[PDB]
């Protein structure tokens, strides 16, 4: 309906959006068991990218119920394709040639997350949520199964258990410091990382979960 412009320049910059994240995300994981190949998970950097996502405006309403003018909701579409990252650090444990024959640090980065999603941002009480609907290209839409009207008489419904990938894209990127076989479990962190973070978007920043910022 209606493309709107954002400031990346002064999102990029705020100290507390971007703490808050980090807040969020590291809270999470605190729910995710770790397996025998790594310790110590953690976020320690964020950086949005240099791009904003695209975003058009599909309607506004008074924040649902479950949130709790001048409070404000938004119904978007995010159309993701820039170049943020996550950073994270563990610790590697290495079980070859013998039980935790070795420990290593390591630093993974999370980056070229692509969506393209619909989206709520509900605005109240200085407080932001944001909360990741669907793909916008999910089957649920086109065979009109699952409605994304917040006012909404059957707002995601039963079927939204269905819901497509919301992640198109996504890589993950070890660095190294780490000559010293170890790229066989690098390997296998980061596919269980991938995997984890996938599943903390989905089960986390999805509805009827939100991310809750300051
Ligand atoms: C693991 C997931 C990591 C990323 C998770 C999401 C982190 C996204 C980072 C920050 C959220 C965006 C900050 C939005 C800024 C708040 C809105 C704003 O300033 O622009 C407002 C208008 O502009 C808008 O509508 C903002 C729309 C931008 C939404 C951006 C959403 C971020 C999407 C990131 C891409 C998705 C990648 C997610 C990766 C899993 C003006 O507000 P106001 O009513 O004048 O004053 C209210 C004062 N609070
Ligand atoms: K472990």
Redesign the pocket.
Known sequence: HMS????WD??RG?LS??Q??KD??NSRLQEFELPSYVNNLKVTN?D??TM??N?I?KQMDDPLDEFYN?D?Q?L?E?D?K?D?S?ELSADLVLNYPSPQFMILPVKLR?SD?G?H?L?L?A?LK?Q?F?S?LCDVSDPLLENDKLQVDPSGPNFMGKRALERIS??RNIKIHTELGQLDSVLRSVGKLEEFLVDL?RN??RKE?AWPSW?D?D
Do not use: R, S
């Open positions: 709107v412009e954002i400031d002064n999102i705020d959006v971007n808050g994240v969020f995300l964020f949005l990218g904003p996502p975003v405006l001048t404000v938004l978007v995010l993701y820039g943020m996550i999370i997350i969506m999603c989206c941002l605005y200085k932001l944001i990741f919301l992640i973070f903390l978007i920043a991310i910022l």
